[PDB]
Symmetry: D2
Subunit: 318 residues, 4 copies
């Protein structure tokens, strides 16, 4: 069989995942959502596009988890976004029940899948999805860091006037105030950003502003669109993860991953650089922090611990 | 300079055009729409995706036509869709004024552009846009037939269980009842569909049903999505046209094109197979019809004439 | 595991196969040849290229068949070319012994492979390789027709001044005088070549000359190079076949395939259009001939029968 | 017009350049060499391959410089390789006269070209070609460092078991003993190699061995092939440079480039990281050396000075 990718959620990110998976000839695609219509429509629309570039891929839409059977990769975008007038607790409340339903469908019908979560709040939902589904911890990851890395690379490539291919961004942690950037492990052509300031290729103030722009990057897009959130960069980010699994590329990508003692952490999903191959999360790359970074990381992990406490307070199973 | 593609309309088709143009490294992209926000948001979101695959392209959003200056290709999706409760005349009424505004921006700021129209009703709006803009008739085309061809190829590839790469669909005219398919010039690996029925690879009833499904294909997607229309296949179709221009590929593509006496028609835009290269519409391929086809084509051109009469009745300039 | 492609023969076609397989991210590659050195050198050179486009593929060279173990696809270019001063019988003599050795390595170490033969004379060597290896007849094919089709498409695209993407060539049989072209099933945008002559897009004499140029096409390249034969088009042709297998594309490609009664032939490999998918040769497309074509096909199959008789006369096992 | 790439030399690197340029749809290709036959044969063979992937590109072969007229990029591989029994002086002697002839053809017929030299010894031949041709110094570069970088990235990706996409190698200078690697500016996912030794991901001895393997890398391939030198990695390397020019990507690539005082050097071609865009060499990235590196760089520039002295001693014009 060709590889099979199931997409749980057929909204703007889901649709974009499905389109990218066709264009990149990754395999056959099933779009799932709770109500018939949109999944089947988007599937057929992309199927109908396929003769133009010449990709051969089966597309279907479904509202029964049986349709995801034997999926090699599952990408989860199901759930609601954070509104103008709802608490973290009500978001967690609604989206945890979504994760329970999703996790039970994956458990029954695609237990060998590599699962990529992109439901918010990410570090909590992926932890929950793994627990609900029972899948091996190395087979469930969250997409976050690749997106922050992609935005920071864009800003850096702009600032230096160089190709996006020759910029590297090193981030850990989560988004926003929970992001932990290491500008010393971010580079142009191998030269750290910290050294580029010393060369006069940029300034400290410009560098700090790009880091802050990365922190704020999701909101920046929300403020422009007014309705809805980013979807092109989030979808490309998750597809990079999926492709590394499917093609056993062993990319090193910052992802929310289950820590078994790496970074001094046990039993939590945290944004860290991981090797993704055909066996899932194969290795975590644990860097050595300076003081500012250790303090930033600890703050960010405390934020995650806070979220998990809130999940547990609203769900017996967790 | 890299090539410059301006996209007039930043809705679902526009966004998908912009994403495809990046992925295919066609050049820099300007998204235009009447109100700031969405164009700039989608532009930045796609820009931010770019480091993941490594495409180098400038993206921007704008609400001033000055931003399209010197565009090599302009793709127009501006305007409103046909509603549940509005007449052809009110659609034409609203969208003609859109074409006047668009045509004046192209005239002033990208007079050398190759222009691809995807505002409805297509055969009328492209005719109008050319008239309003004053651009050479060979430099303004409408996207329609490639989309019908793509849907019919999908259905055929399904039916025969063969690659989408080895199916060819021949269509002329417009969509729906105005489509003029030639199943005898549609093939699998060079073998006409009419001969595949004789071989027993399909049946006449199945073939007729695929032709009818192609006619109904846009509505099929609308019925599934419930809100909004197809956008992946329409965007891929227009990008194939744009790429043929930009790369001087000389693809032979069914497009709404200005006829200077080909097919016995003068002064109308009609869906015909055209060679698209760096000089725009370079040649029209005028096939020889059988009787059923000639009658179908004449009906379809009468429908176009009807539309143009309606345009003229609601606009002095036309 | 990633897919595994073994290439038996590390000459110019083999090297080009290996390069294409990397660029197209088809999987890991083993280059085999009888003497160490060249396979390992070409493998390492391509491996070393890989960081430039970013393909992840393992490359190795070997002179032991154990190295091909579990290959998903095997492509055979081993053997000698026809010289200025050697008979068909001495070519067959030398290359049959090559096929025996190759077939025994495939039998032992990659019995589930899809095997693509490109040792001359093609219709005989593939028949022999299948017999020596014992693999299922649907899992062993010869590359020939795709190459003739590719050359004829190039000539046609030149003549009409249109994209190579919009030309289809229909050929059966073998090369040279054994080729059986059907110009009526060859098209530009679905319009048969026979109809393009009637439209004045070309002439009968030009069409006949392109058919003859296709027949002579391998020699044309030999006359220019002076040492050695074509290798880019032959390698691209075989990779199209391999990709259809690996990605289950179900391309319809003219290939030397084992006939179980199709075209009225039993027990011979003949150039025919076949559906290639994950199960190998899945279906043969048997067209209906006109008189000239039936006579051409019968002549061409008699030529194949002649070759097989010659093989049998020089090998007990056959 | 499509972009035009002229390839001066139709040997194994030239052929591979031509194939890559087609596959990557960079433009039309002219293969030049001194004797008719091989250029025209390889051109036609690649042209004939093109329908298989669907690239539209004109290919031709020529032995008159008029055929390169208006080339946007010229890639020079003409000349002889260093033999088992010839001196540096006889190599320089023969290949300087080649550069004079090439430079005069470029001067007359493609004076606006971006020129990429890959004739040995590289740092001298590119300096000579620029002088003979009279083209702007920012429009003539040599391919060397990208190749060393590509080989070192391959070795590193092997050693760490990670994707080639996530490794960066920083080299300056020339090949062999004249290479100046900076392992501290070489990274996996932004983490310097020096830090990966501290993490235990590799060892110092392994790192040193990969650096030495990079130095010896061209000879390693020569020892395996026995006849001829590497060609896949050299061709991919030069195409990356050409693509950055053609698509205005502003890649940062180590290339032999004319120094106007950067790195403390005036009037010499030296391997340094340069920004390549539509204006040629746009900026040199001048890093800050530690002591070991400064001494290595000075040794390597003294070697270049030695070569240039030898050129001047055998040519009045220089
Ligand atoms: Ca393809
Ligand atoms: Ca530790
Ligand atoms: Ca690239
Ligand atoms: Ca006529
Ligand atoms: Ca990639
Ligand atoms: Ca039969
Ligand atoms: Ca194409
Ligand atoms: Ca300086």
């Amino acid at each position: 069989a060709r590889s099979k990718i199931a997409l749980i959620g057929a909204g703007q990110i889901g649709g974009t995942l499905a389109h990218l998976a066709g264009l990149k000839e990754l395999g056959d695609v099933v779009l799932f959502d709770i109500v018939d219509g949109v999944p089947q429509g988007k599937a057929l629309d992309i199927a109908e596009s396929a003769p133009v570039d010449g990709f051969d891929a089966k597309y279907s839409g479904a509202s029964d988890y049986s349709a995801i059977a034997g999926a090699d990769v599952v990408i989860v975008t199901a759930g609601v976004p954070r509104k103008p007038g709802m608490s973290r607790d009500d978001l967690i409340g609604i989206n945890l029940k979504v994760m329970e339903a999703v996790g039970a469908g994956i458990k029954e019908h695609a237990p060998d899948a590599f699962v990529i979560c992109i439901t918010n709040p990410l570090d909590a939902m992926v932890w929950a999805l793994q627990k609900f589904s029972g899948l091996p911890t190395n087979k469930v990851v969250g997409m976050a860091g690749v997106l922050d890395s992609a935005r920071f690379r864009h800003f850096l490539a702009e600032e230096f006037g160089v190709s996006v291919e020759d910029v590297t961004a090193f981030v850990l942690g989560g988004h926003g105030d929970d992001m932990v950037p290491l500008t010393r492990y971010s580079t142009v052509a191998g030269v750290p950003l910290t050294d580029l300031v010393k060369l006069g290729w940029t300034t400290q103030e410009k560098l700090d502003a790009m880091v802050e722009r990365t922190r704020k990057g999701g909101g920046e897009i929300v403020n422009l669109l007014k309705t809805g959130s980013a979807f092109y960069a989030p979808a490309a980010s998750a597809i990079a993860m999926a492709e590394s699994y499917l093609r056993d590329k062993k990319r090193v990508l910052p992802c929310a991953a289950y820590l078994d003692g790496q970074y001094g952490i046990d039993g939590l999903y945290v944004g860290v650089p991981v090797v993704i191959g055909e066996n899932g999360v194969e290795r975590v790359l644990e860097v050595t922090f300076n003081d500012d970074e250790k303090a930033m990381f600890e703050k960010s992990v405390n934020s995650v611990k806070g979220l998990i406490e809130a999940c547990k307070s609203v769900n017996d199973k967790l």
